[PDB]
Amino acid sequence: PGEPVVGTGASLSVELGPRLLTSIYDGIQRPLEVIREKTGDFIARGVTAPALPRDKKWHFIPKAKVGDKVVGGDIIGEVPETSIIVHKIMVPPGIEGEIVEIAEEGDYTIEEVIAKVKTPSGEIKELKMYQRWPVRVKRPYKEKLPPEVPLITGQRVIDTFFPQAKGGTAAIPGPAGSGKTVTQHQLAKWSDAQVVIYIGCGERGNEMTDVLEEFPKLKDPKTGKPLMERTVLIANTSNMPVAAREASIYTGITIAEYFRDMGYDVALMADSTSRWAEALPAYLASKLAEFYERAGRVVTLGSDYRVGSVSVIGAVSPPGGDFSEPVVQNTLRVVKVFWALDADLARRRHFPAINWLTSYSLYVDAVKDWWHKNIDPEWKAMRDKAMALLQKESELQEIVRIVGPDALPERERAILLVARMLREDYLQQDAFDEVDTYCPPEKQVTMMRVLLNFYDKTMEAINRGVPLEEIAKLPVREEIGRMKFERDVSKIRSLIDKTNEQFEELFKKYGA
């Protein structure tokens, strides 16, 4: 509306209800292009359009009845919104009491009052299929849970060495381009979040166009349905007001929090480094912080025990291609994970071009018990071992650069052989391949066991006089290089026995 009050200005809010999905907005949730506003401490002014259509009929299913006691977050109905997502109709935060009136199953437009609640006062509150929330106010919840369950991306280098927790905070520094774009796209479509809130575009120039024309064609690989049906986009464009681009990340995170309150895992993804806007280094630092602080996995409001999360992934691309700060350095300081895309790795044709020495995740210990309990009790021991091999490989390659390869002992040559297999057979991954576009957790640990078992057999064999050239030509080495294209994890698993057997024949052949 247009009401003015002391403190934060015209309370800038979003409409939360059905039809949000598949929608594209600007920084303050207008369907249109353009935008208009004056961001300050004091206030902000804006008029035009409706965020949610009032014309569309929604199929309402009641999930409560007259006489039920309710609190904020209680689910009182369901609406099938898209062919992917069921919209859960919740009591707005701050409302409690008895349901004295609830709609029957029928078709309704969003201004229709689908229930009434009598509060303890006796005051009668009318509930609709949508609700409103100030974007600068974090939606409430019962409890923020410590990081614990991984957001599974299906990308080996991430899930294994640099994991993201559901509710966690990630950034992707490094050069913009196909690399970043492909990784962004793999994350959005493969991560086990049900809903994606995507902020950006505006970064390229032809980008708004490609979004307008290609994004409706993209499929959700999980369902074969349009990805648009689990997505909401917020566009920050060069023509749009400074004020609104400022606000877009609050709009974004409020909409994400609303889907978490229903019990979904949501991924909030940002790719709007350049277009982010400033009216008037501590200003940037505080705004980054207030945003990232809102990520989290929570026990939601409601009378049933229920958990949802917002995981934040922010692409950070230097404004003028400038390696240095500020945007880059503060954001890396706030997030708990980053995936450093690296142009030299791209030129070595190592894809995805995630530098496994400069990336880091502070969630390894937080997610390990989940991996241990659900997938493989050796997950953490194996990641640590593979990383130590990579760390060793890097020190050796530096030494070798200076003194040459000709006086390397067999043990050191073997380390290099196996590190190379780790980099090519495991870290490298093919987003374009119909099998290797996603790697299930059970496949990740099984490929890793195959590789680490090969390493152990390699060092045992070195130890017993087998020459390294023989290990390098072992037929099984080359099936290991193809494990990633195999859909059937038991065929991958059998490489362990196959490896043991070929090494045995090498032992018989040397009397070793």
UniProtKB/Swiss-Prot annotation:
Entry annotated with the keyword Transport: yes
GO biological process: intein-mediated protein splicing; intron homing; proton motive force-driven plasma membrane ATP synthesis
UniProt keyword terms in alphabetical order: ATP synthesis, ATP-binding, Autocatalytic cleavage, Cell membrane, Endonuclease, Hydrogen ion transport, Hydrolase, Intron homing, Ion transport, Membrane, Nuclease, Nucleotide-binding, Protein splicing, Translocase, Transport
Family membership: Belongs to the ATPase alpha/beta chains family.
Name of protein: A-type ATP synthase subunit A
Post-translational modification remark: This protein undergoes a protein self splicing that involves a post-translational excision of the VDE intervening region (intein) followed by peptide ligation.
Keyword field contains Hydrolase: yes
Compartments where found: Cell membrane
Reaction catalysed by this enzyme: ATP + H2O + 4 H(+)(in) = ADP + phosphate + 5 H(+)(out)
InterPro entries listed in its UniProt record: ATP-synt_VA_C, ATP-synth_a_Xtn, ATP_synth_asu-like_sf, ATPase_a/bsu_AS, ATPase_F1/V1/A1_a/bsu_N, ATPase_F1/V1/A1_a/bsu_N_sf, ATPase_F1/V1/A1_a/bsu_nucl-bd, ATPase_F1/V1_b/a_C
Gene transcribed to yield this protein: atpA
One Gene Ontology molecular-function label: proton-transporting ATP synthase activity, rotational mechanism
EC number(s) on file: 7.1.2.2, 3.1.-.-
